[PDB]
Structure 1
Amino acid sequence: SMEQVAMELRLTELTRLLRSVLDQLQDKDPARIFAQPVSLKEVPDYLDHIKHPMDFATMRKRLEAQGYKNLHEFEEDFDLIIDNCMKYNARDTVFYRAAVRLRDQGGVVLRQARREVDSIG
Structure 2
Amino acid sequence: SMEQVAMELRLTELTRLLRSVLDQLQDKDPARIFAQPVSLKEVPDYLDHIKHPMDFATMRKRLEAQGYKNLHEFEEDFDLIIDNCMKYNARDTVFYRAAVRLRDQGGVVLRQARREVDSIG
TM-score by length of 1: 1.00
RMSD (Å), alpha carbons: 0.1
Give the secondary-structure state (helix, strand or coil) at the position aligned to 2:37.
Answer: coil
**Distance between the aligned counterparts of 1:110 and 1:75, measured in 2?**
8
Q: Deviations over 1:87-115 (max 9, x none)?
A: 00000000000000000000000000000
**Distance between the aligned counterparts of 1:105 and 1:40, measured in 2?**
28
Q: Displacement, 1:29?
A: 0.1
Q: Displacement, 1:53?
A: 0.0
Q: Deviations over 1:36-71 (max 9, x none)?
A: 000000000000000000000000000000000000
1:63 matched to 2:63? The reply is yes
**Distance between the aligned counterparts of 2:114 and 2:43, measured in 1?**
35
Residue equivalent to 1:119: 119
**Distance between the aligned counterparts of 1:31 and 1:91, measured in 2?**
18
Q: Displacement, 1:12?
A: 0.0
**Distance between the aligned counterparts of 1:34 and 1:116, measured in 2?**
25
**Distance between the aligned counterparts of 1:7 and 1:16, measured in 2?**
14
Aligned length: 121
Unpaired segments ≥5 residues, structure 2: none
Unpaired segments ≥5 residues, structure 1: none
Residue equivalent to 1:86: 86
Q: Displacement, 1:17?
A: 0.1
